[PDB]
Design brief:
The structure is a homohexamer.
Chain A lengths: L2 E5 L4 H10 L10 E7 L5 H11 L3 E7 L4 E7 L2 H15 L10 E8 L4 H9 L11 E8 L4 H11 L3 E6 L5 E7 L1 H16 L2
Antiparallel strand pairs in A: 1-2, 2-4, 3-4, 5-6, 6-8, 7-8
Amino acid sequence: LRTYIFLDALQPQLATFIGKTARGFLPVPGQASLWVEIAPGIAINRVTDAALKATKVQPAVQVVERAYGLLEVHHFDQGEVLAAGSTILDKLEVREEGRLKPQVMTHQIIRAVEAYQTQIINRNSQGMMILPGESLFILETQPAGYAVLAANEAEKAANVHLVNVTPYGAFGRLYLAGSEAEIDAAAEAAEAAIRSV
Amino acid sequence: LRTYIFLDALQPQLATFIGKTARGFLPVPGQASLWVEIAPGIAINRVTDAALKATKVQPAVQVVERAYGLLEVHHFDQGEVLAAGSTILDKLEVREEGRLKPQVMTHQIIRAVEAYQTQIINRNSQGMMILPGESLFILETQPAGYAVLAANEAEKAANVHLVNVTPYGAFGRLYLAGSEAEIDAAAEAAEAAIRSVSGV
Amino acid sequence: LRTYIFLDALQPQLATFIGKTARGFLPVPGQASLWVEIAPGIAINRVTDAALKATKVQPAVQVVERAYGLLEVHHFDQGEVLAAGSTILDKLEVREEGRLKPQVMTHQIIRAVEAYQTQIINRNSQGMMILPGESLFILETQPAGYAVLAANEAEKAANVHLVNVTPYGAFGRLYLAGSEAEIDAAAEAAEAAIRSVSGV
Amino acid sequence: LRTYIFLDALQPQLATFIGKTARGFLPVPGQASLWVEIAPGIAINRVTDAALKATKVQPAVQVVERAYGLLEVHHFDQGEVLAAGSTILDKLEVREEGRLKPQVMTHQIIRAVEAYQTQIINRNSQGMMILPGESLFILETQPAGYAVLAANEAEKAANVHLVNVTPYGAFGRLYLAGSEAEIDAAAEAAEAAIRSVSGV
Amino acid sequence: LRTYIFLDALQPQLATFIGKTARGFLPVPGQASLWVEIAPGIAINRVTDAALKATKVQPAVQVVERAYGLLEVHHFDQGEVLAAGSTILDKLEVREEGRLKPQVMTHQIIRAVEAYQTQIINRNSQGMMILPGESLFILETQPAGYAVLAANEAEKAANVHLVNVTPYGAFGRLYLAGSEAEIDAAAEAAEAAIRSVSG
Amino acid sequence: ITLRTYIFLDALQPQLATFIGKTARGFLPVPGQASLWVEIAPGIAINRVTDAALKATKVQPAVQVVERAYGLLEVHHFDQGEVLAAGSTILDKLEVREEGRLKPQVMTHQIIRAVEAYQTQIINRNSQGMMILPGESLFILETQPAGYAVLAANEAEKAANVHLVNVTPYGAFGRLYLAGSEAEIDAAAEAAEAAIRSVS
C-alpha cells in the first residue's frame, strides 16, 4: 500500500484536470474522491474490483505504470466513497495507517517566472496556463499518489491555478501558478496537508 | 492571399497557447505577430523563405493544409514584422487590402456550462481549462487565419480564458471561458475585430 | 439535422468501443443512447447544453469534425434519453422525421481475410482484432452518425466482433469480423437497420 | 484506377521512409514495389484481398482516405509484384494505360533554406532532416500516388535526401533536400519521371 | 541475458497483437518466434545483427526502453529461428541456461469484471476487448520478456481473448479475458509454462 | 540537489541543433550557437536552475525535461559569454563548482558494421534524426548520466562525416546512434569516447 488518501470534496480545477487527462469515468467538482496506490502495478485491478462490487463508486483512474498502480474512486456521497475505502483495506488486509508516509522531495516557490520558462512548462502541461510574471509553486512528493491531496487543499486554500499534477510514477509532481501572496498561502496549505498524513 | 492580419502585440494567453501548439520558434507575450494564410498551401514555404531572408522575424507557425497554407512570423519590433509582411505581399503581387475580408460565420454564448460538457471541451483543448458553471464563447471565422485576431482582441478586451483557437482550415474556431459578463465583452470585441478588417 | 438515431440499449462491444475512443462520460452496456449529428457542426455545443440542462443524460461524445458535429447522450432510463432528444429537436426547431434518411453507400464482405491484410486493418482500428481467415464486413453510411445504428443492430443479430466504427465525417464507416455466416447475418441486420430509418 | 506505377526497385531512402511510416509489412531497398490508387477508397480492401489471394506479395501500405484509397505491394521478385498488378488490373477491368496520366502541378526549389524554416519543416517530417543552407525541392503530383515515382527516380538520379513524401490525398507531396546541384538534378529527374508515365 | 525463450508456433491472437503494436516486420500465425531480452538496453543491436547476418529470420521487435532491450525474430522454418538463437548465444558466449529464470510476481483471476473496470482496461489496451462480466487473468513476470510464453501457451490451451501483453519494461504484464473456467485453463497452462523454464 | 550533468558546447553542430529543433519542447536552437546542458535531481527542481539562468542572462532554453526521476536544462545563445555567464550563475546558485558534477562514463560503446535492412528499418522507425541506410555502420553509445550524450553527439559530428540518427540525453541512460561509413563511424566513435573520458 503506497498511497491511501481521501478527499472529502474535489475542488473545481482538480476535478476538471482529472477529467481532461484521466482515462476512466470523469469526476465532477464536489464529489468525494479516494486515491489508492499499490505495488505491484497490475494488482490494482484486484482493489478496483473489490470497491466496485461493494459500492456505487465510479473510478476516474486506474493507471498501471512502469512499477506501480493507482486507483481513484469517487461519488457525491462521502460515506459511499468511505465504504469503498474500507472494502479496499479489508481486501488488502491493512489499515489506513499502514500506508507509506508521504515525503516531500521538493517544495519551492519561483517568483515572476520568465516567459521562456512558462512556455516550456505550459507546453508540457494540460492544466491552466502559467503566464509570465506569475509565481510558481513546485511540489514533488514520494510516493506519487499523495500529490492530489496537496493539489486539492492548495486550491481550497488560495486563489491559484492548477497547472499540472502527476500523481503516478516514481514521484508525484504538482505545479501551481498565481500571485506571490496566493501561492504562498497555497504552498503552506499543500505542505500542511502532506505533513498531516 | 486569404488572410493577412497583423497583431500589434500578442496577449499573454494567446502567446502561451501558440507556445503550446506551434511547431516553430515559440513567441512570447508583447511581440508583434503577423499571420498569413494563402492558397495554394504548398507555396507557403516560398513565402516563409522570402520573409526570413529579408527580416529578423522568427516563425512560430508554418502549416501546410490539404489546400491552404498558414504562416506566423513575430518580433518585438513591429518594423521587422511589417517589413516581413510587405515582403510577402510584394512577392504575392497583392496589396494588404487584397486579402479576403473575414466574416463572422458562427458566434454563440453558452451560459453556465455543465460539468459533463466542460470535460469534452477540455479534452479537445490545449489552452486554459473551462470550469463548470463558466460561460463559453464559440466563434467561427472565414477564412480561418483571422481567428487569432478574434482571440487576441478578445483577450485584450475582457478577463476571459483562452480555451482553444484553431486558425487553420476552412473555418477558424475560437473557444473562450469566463464569467457571463466577461464573455459578453469578449464576444463583442472578437466580433467587432473581425468586422473591422478591410478586404475583398 | 443530419443524424438523429435512438439506440434502445447499447450492446456490449459497441459500448466498450465507445469507452475506448470517446472523450466524454463513458457509457456501459444496456444504456439507452441517442446520437445527433448536425450542420453547422460547431453548433453542437448548444445542442449538448440544452440536453444536459433539461435532463440527467450523460454525454459520451461531442465531436467537432470539420463541417458536422456529433453528440452522444446516454442513460439507463430510456425516458431520460427520449426527453433529451425532444429537447434537442425543439432547440433545433426540427422534428425527428426531418432528419436525413440514411443510405447504405457501400457494403462489402471480404471472406477469409489474409494475415497480411488483418495486420493493416488492426493497426488502423481500436476495437476487436480481426484474426486471419475471418470474414470482414465493411459498411459506409450517409450520414455518418447512423453508423452506430448499424454497429449496434449487427451486434444484436450475430456473433461477430466490432473491429472499428467511425460515426463522424462525410461517410460513417463500420468494420466487423467473424465467420462467414455470422458476418452475413451481421451485414443483413446492419443494412436493414439503415433502411428502416425514416427521414428526408 | 487513379495510380498504377511499378517501381522496379525501391531506392534506399524511399524504402526506409516507408519503413518509418507505413502500417503494413515493411519493405526493404531493392524490392519491386507496385502502388495502386483507386476511387472509391473503401474498395481498397477488396483490391488488397485480390492481390494477396493471387500472389505472394506483402502490403506495406493500405490507406483508406476520405475519397481515395492507396495500396502498396512489394516482393523481392519483380514477377510476384507484376503478377499482383496483372491481377489487380484484371479485377478492375482496366489496363495499365487506363490509369490517370500524372501531371506536375507544382515544382519549387527554395535555395539555402534558413535555419528557422528547416526547423518547422523537420518537425513536420519523418525522413531525412533538411539542414540549414541546403536547397529544398517541393513537388506536387496528381494523382498523389505517383509521388513515390518522383521520389524513387529523384533518388536514383541525384545525391539528395528524402525529407518527406505523402502519396495520398488530392496531391502527392515530395520534399527533397541537398546541395543546389544535387537538387537541380533531382528535380529534373523527378519531373521527367512523372512526364514519362503514360495513361489517360 | 535477461530473457531467452523460443515459441514453436505463434498463436493467432498473439501474432495479431504483435502485428498491431510492434515496430518491425510483422509476424503471422504459425511462425516460430524467438524472444531475447538483455541489458544494457542499447546493446540489443549487437544481438539483432548477429541473428540477421547468420539467418533469414525477420525481426518483429527491437525495443530499447528505459533500461533493457528486447528482440523478437521469427520465420516459418523453426530451423532458421533455432539457428538464429544459437548464433545469438554463441556471440554472447552464454548458454541457454544462463538466462534469468522468470518469476511470477502477480497471478490473479478477477471474476465477472464490472463495466466500470473493463472500460478502463480496454481504453489502455490494444488487444481484444474484455467485456463486462468476463473474467480477467492478470500475470506479471520478471524479466518482462517471458510474458510472451504465457500468452502463447495460454491461447493454445483455452478459448480466451488476449487483451494485452507487454513483454518489455521492468515487468512483463499479461491480460487475458474469457469465461472463468476457460480463464482458469489458460492460467493453468500459462503458469505451468513460466515455471517450466530453467535459468 | 544533485548535479548530474553539466557540459558546455562551444558551438552546436548542424545535425545536433536540427535534431534538438525537431524534437525538443522549448526555444529551439540553430547551428553555431553555444549550448549548456544541466541535469539534476530531484527532477522538478530544474525549474530553479532555469529561473536563475534566465533572470541573469539573455540565454534561451531549448530543453527543460522533467522525466521519471531527473530534470535536464539546455540554454543557448550565439554569444558564448551569455551561455557561460548562465552556467556560472547556475553553479554559484547550486553552491557547487563545475567539477562537482557526476563524472560521465562510457558505458556501452559499439560499432555494428554493415547493418542489415531489417534492423535499420526498426532503428529508423524508433528514431527522429537522419536515416540509417542498409549497409552503413552504426555507432551506439550509452552514457551515464544521460545529459552528457549531447557532448558525444556534438564532438562526433565535428570529427567525422556521419549522420545523427538519434540522441536521448535524458532518462536513466543517455543514448547516441550515429550512421555512416565504417571509417567515418570509427572516427566519430573515437571523438565521442575521448570527449566523455575527458570530463572531470
